[PDB]
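Agenda item 2: calcium ion complex prediction
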Amino acid sequence: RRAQKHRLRELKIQVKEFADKEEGGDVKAVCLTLFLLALRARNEHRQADELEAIMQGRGSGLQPAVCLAIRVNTFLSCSQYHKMYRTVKAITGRQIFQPLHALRNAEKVLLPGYHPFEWQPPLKNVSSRTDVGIIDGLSGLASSVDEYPVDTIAKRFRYDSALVSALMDMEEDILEGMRSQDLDDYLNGPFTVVVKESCDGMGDVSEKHGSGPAVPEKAVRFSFTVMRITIEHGSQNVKVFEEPKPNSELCCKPLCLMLADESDHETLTAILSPLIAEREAMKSSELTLEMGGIPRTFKFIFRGTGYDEKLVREVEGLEASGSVYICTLCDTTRLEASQNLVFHSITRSHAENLQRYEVWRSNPYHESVEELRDRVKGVSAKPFIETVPSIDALHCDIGNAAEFYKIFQLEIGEVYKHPNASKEERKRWQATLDKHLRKRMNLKPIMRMNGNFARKLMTQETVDAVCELIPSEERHEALRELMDLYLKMKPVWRSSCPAKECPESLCQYSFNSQRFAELLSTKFKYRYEGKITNYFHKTLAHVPEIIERDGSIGAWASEGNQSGNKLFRRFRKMNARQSKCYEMEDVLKHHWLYTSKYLQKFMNAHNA
Amino acid sequence: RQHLLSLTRRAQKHRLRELKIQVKEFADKEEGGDVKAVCLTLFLLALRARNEHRQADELEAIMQGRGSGLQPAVCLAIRVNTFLSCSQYHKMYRTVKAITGRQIFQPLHALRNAEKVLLPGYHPFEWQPPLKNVSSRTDVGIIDGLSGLASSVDEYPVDTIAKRFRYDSALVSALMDMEEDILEGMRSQDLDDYLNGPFTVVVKESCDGMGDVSEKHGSGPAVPEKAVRFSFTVMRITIEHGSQNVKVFEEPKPNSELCCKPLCLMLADE
Ligand SMILES: [Ca+2]
Ligand SMILES: [Ca+2]
Ligand SMILES: [Ca+2]
Ligand SMILES: [Ca+2]
Ligand SMILES: [Zn+2]
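Presented output:
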């Protein structure tokens, strides 16, 4: 104390004089600054940063929301977290992670069913309460032995109680947009939300915990997404909010989930009917809800697009994918689209589909089945989901990839010269192709193609390698030029907002696709004279119109929900109470918390 | 001039560099070329002279002492006892740092360079008399279990995998992971810590097969492959002080789940 004080009291009082005469005498500021500088000079800035923090007066503790973000976005348990918490608190004295109870109390403020909200007019058939959490998905389905045996499990939210929370977590992110777009913050116009709906079975979720094989089980998740929030200020509308990366796995929120085969039609309808009830109810009403102080009014638009091919083929009520009728958007038989190549439109809506099923069931013309089926263009069931039609992206690209992979395997045998080989030359061709590719481009052998493989194989390098394997020469043009046409075509739908990103390939798509068409019809007509596959009709005839109809083609895809599948399994065996009736409550709740935005706003701290 | 805190990065640097230079050269010729240490001392005095012992005490803690932040060993301990991955730990660390300003957890490389002190083959040791048929180096970590088994198409076909520590290096690491416990023991037993009597260790060894540890990959069946793990346990350390042996360390929970240390493991059958 006095020891060091008198050890250099000379220089102490001297620097006091100097700080008074020049720096005025803010001894605190100058002394601290010179110590931080003398410490930084020698590159030990850890102490510099922590000391600046402790002098600035920032508590080391964390708001419960942050530690919750950590626990949910790092897949910790509810006891491992306790381990970490108690060890940190014991080591460094002051607690840095909040306890568990204070984590749950801040968990509740984000799960759905916590805020007041009122509809105008009140939704018919929808309850008025505002405190509904995780509702049993079965919807009070009477299950007694005298009735139909039903055994699946299902959990869900309501639909309004989920939209409310999805909006009130992004309150700040919509207000910031309102500011950035030069708008008076205190505005309560009729906001309009755009919500993309999706669904896709993700079977083979079980585990042979008993080491006994041959026991499968499937599951289904019905989930939605907010994609654009728009207000009509003055004369026109403005994009108060838009989604950065729509078809990813962190911005698609689950709404219900169940353990039932995606084709078990009866159970599927029995569980998914209430959702469509609520969805049709809240399509002609307004939701009043305070949004950062003053109240605001919301209205919605629901586009159902994230449906693969099999679902949209089944629930919308068409004959299965092996039909003579191919396009879910127009009514043409493969043996007709293969001839009239690209001049179609979209003429298969949902209400048309429904009245067509009606004219099927009633059969007013007293005509036989074989021509009635043709009259009703292949509708044979009652559709129960209003879904907009549009090409998927992920599965379309994978299909095209496997498609021209098979054409490569075909061109090995050069069957155009000698046709009609048997199914052993074919296996030999496949083996030769796979070995040559593994030797040249090191493309591993795989049976079920993955998007990574699909991107790996659509390259000029690999087509040149196979072109150097194959004997003849005309095949060189007839394959390399086809492949470069395909690559010139792909981005206008692979993109996420190609309305302006690649606004040249779009305007050239007409030529870029009709040349593909003509050459497939001329130099390859030895395969495409009759049967043409479906996706090679979709990409050919519809996308240059679906773009102008909707906008993106990538953003309206199911890549997001699909990517989520993995997460399921993880949560299932790191967060579950082992009751087959809470094993879905917990999974749904954790998936909800994960897919929030008010949480990821913390995990993106280091950037900003 | 406005305030050294309101200015930009080196704004204050140029503003006060005059006084900085004069008194820093005076002080480095005073105490032989050192400014940061005496500068923090005078900072301590000139600040806590305004009745603010709090920040001075926490500063004395954080500098040349523990307190805030975590020793790399601690963060390693929690990372391995909570079965966290690597990228997960990175996420937690970076977001904690970005939020609370300070740096509580340590980075990754500063964790590898701090786990390299607990695996075998880091310490120096000397056998005497030397060990027949045993190498003498002290840099033997993981080594292949097959021990250089000729595996070509002309000899007995082998298709197993095995990894192991050398016995001596693993054993010396077991000893240098309980130095503190044996010291506390001989202290409590009223001995002298400056003692290097010939301690006698008593070890326990075990080997039990753990068959059926495969799992289905992708979406399909699995194959019944077994596995074997050879492991030991330090169990009782003693020393013969004076005329009789005195017990210096015993295991609290002998057959516990976390005091049998692995030594070798293989994907074979028993
Ligand atoms: Ca599917
Ligand atoms: Ca899928
Ligand atoms: Ca056993
Ligand atoms: Ca055994
Ligand atoms: Zn069509």
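Discussion summary: The longest helix of chain B spans residues 11-30.
Owner for follow-up: CH.
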